[PDB]
Each structure stands twice: as C-alpha cells, then as structure tokens.
Amino acid sequence: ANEGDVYKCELCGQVVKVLEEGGGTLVCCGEDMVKQ
C-alpha cells in the first residue's frame, strides 16, 4: 500500500505496520483491513 502505514482489522483487531509496500491488500477475517 504505502510504507510507513498501519492496517487494523475491523474484526479481530490485528494491527500491522507496513514497512515494505507491495501491490495488494491485507484481507483479514474475510475483510480488507482498514488503514489507520
């Protein structure tokens, strides 16, 4: 997505800080993680 970003799941509540962007999404709990 964009280095130095954070993605939090709106289901479990998993938060991960992207340190290396790629070209996809973090579908967690069958739901595309949200950005913080």
Residue with tokens 């799941």: 9
Q: How far is the CB of 29 from a copy of itself (least distance, A)?
A: 4
For a copy of itself (CB under 8 A), the number of binding residues is: 25
Tokens of 6: 């954070």
Answer for which of 4, 23, 34, 35 binds a copy of itself (CB under 8 A) is 23
User: Which of residues 4 and 30 has its CB atom nearest to Cd ion in the complex?
Assistant: 30
Q: Report the distance separating Cα 10 and Cα 20, nearest Å.
A: 22
Backbone angles phi, psi at 26, to 5 degrees: -110, 80
35 binds a copy of itself (CB under 8 A): no
